[PDB]
Design a protein around this ligand. Structure first.
Ligand code: 1FW
Ligand code: GLC
Length: 427
């Protein structure tokens, strides 16, 4: 690597977070998680620590047979599932259906009429119209669906079917990863938003009576920062993003991490560098000066550049810029600075959860299931994230996994849990 321009590095170094900074954040997050779990303070807590009712012990045992409906981009899978017996066997049969142009381009109602017709055909094929099966949705993308399907089934009026509430995406991640690795007790998403769930000791889940076993808690930790917990770490860019957001003052933690805001943060950093005459010869394009024009996907593409600067040039050319080679290199480092800080901030949260779990259970081996566009698509984000988390979690051995599509059985397990939960809750 070349000797970087000192004045650029001074600006980009603003994003640095030292171990002590992350430990401070981690401790603050842990106090907010405490606040969310306790009966006395839950109502006012910003980090809600929602009980998911997904317990460490099997429940809804009367749910044996169910449907799982996996929504892809332009097709879907209907799957009939039987969960049986000491670890669960997940027995399946399924069918892929292509969504025709007709059904994909009309109203959501018409689309779900078509989906319902396919379910009907599927149940006819497998001679299952004698049962009112529960159905859970899963998503495998490269108005809400529960309601649309519920309405469409009512519309048909020929077979009865319950559509169960979906679990949170973090919970779905944990469950699907658990299918592959039974030490998975944490689910996390780093996509457009950022969130985590984990298996909390029932004694600490004060919102649900009982001290036996564990229950998954959905932290909804994106809301962290409400009372200034992150203020000392906020940069001018963060303040601007927040001020122009739909919910100023809220979701400040998520605003530091999520793909919703990452590109915009980079844009503002680039404009700062332009204003200081360190980038594009002090001349920004009209596109560069337009809110939202630097898409988060551009950040990942810039960091994917192989060294020839062609990926970076193509992004910047699209923005009406004619970057020099130095301009391209600076943009890469600006992207790296923002994404690294996101990884650092995210690691403080997960570290807080993991260290809490270790002390609640009193060295800990644990698997963390992770999904989301940023974690998956962003070059080296997961690697930087992993390294930081591990640095903050001494005496824990953390394995990170991503759900493998496989034969859809991980997704089937998500639906099993969703259906069993709905049964347990009297829905
Ligand atoms: O289904 C469960 N709990 C429910 N609560 C309410 C309705 S169903 C838990 C969930 C898992 C999730 C991952 C962490 C450990 C508990 N679960 C899931 N899948 C399993 C598969 C094999 C096995 F031997 C046990 C379980 C199990 O307890
Ligand atoms: O998509 C990841 C996360 O985004 C937001 O934080 C949502 O509030 C949360 O429910 C979800 O888990």
């Amino acid at each position: 690597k070349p000797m970087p321009l000192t004045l650029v590095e001074q600006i980009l170094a603003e994003f640095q977070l030292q171990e002590e900074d992350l430990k401070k954040v981690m401790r603050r997050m842990q106090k907010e998680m405490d606040r969310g779990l306790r009966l006395e303070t839950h109502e006012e807590a910003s980090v809600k620590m929602l009980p998911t009712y997904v317990r460490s012990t099997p429940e809804g045992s009367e749910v044996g047979d169910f449907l799982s409906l996996d929504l892809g981009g332009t097709n879907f899978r209907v799957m009939l599932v039987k969960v049986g017996e000491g670890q669960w066997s997940v027995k399946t049969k399924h069918q892929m259906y292509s969504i025709p142009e007709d059904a994909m381009t009309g109203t959501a109602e018409m689309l779900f009429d078509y989906i319902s017709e396919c379910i009907s055909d599927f149940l006819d094929k497998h001679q299952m119209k004698h049962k009112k099966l529960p159905l859970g949705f899963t998503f495998s993308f490269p108005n809400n669906v529960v309601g649309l399907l519920r309405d469409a089934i009512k519309r048909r009026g020929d077979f009865e079917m319950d559509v169960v509430a979906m679990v949170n995406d973090t919970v779905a991640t944990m469950i699907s990863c658990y299918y592959e690795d039974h030490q998975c007790e944490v689910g996390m998403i780093v996509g457009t938003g950022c969130n985590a769930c984990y298996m909390e000791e029932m004694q600490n889940v004060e919102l649900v009576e009982g001290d036996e076993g564990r229950m998954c808690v959905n932290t909804e930790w994106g809301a962290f920062g409400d009372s200034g917990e992150l203020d000392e770490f906020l940069l001018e860019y963060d303040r601007l993003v927040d001020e122009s957001s739909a919910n100023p003052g809220q979701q400040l933690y998520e605003k530091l991490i999520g793909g919703k805001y990452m590109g915009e943060l980079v844009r503002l950093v680039l404009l700062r560098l332009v204003d200081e005459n360190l980038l594009f010869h002090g001349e920004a394009s009209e596109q560069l000066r337009t809110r939202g024009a630097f898409e988060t996907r551009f950040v990942s593409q810039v960091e994917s550049d192989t060294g020839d600067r062609k990926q970076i040039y193509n992004i910047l050319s699209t923005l009406g810029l004619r970057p020099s080679t130095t301009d391209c290199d600076i943009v890469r480092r600006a992207c790296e600075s923002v994404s690294t800080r996101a990884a650092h901030m995210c690691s403080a949260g997960l570290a807080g959860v993991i260290n809490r779990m270790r002390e609640s259970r009193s060295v800990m081996r644990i698997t963390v299931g992770v999904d989301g566009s940023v974690y998956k698509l962003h070059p080296s984000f997961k690697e930087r994230f992993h390294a930081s988390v591990r640095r903050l979690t001494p005496s824990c051995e953390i394995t990170f996994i991503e759900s493998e599509e496989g034969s859809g059985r991980g997704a089937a397990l998500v639906s099993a849990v969703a259906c069993k939960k709905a049964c347990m809750l009297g829905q």
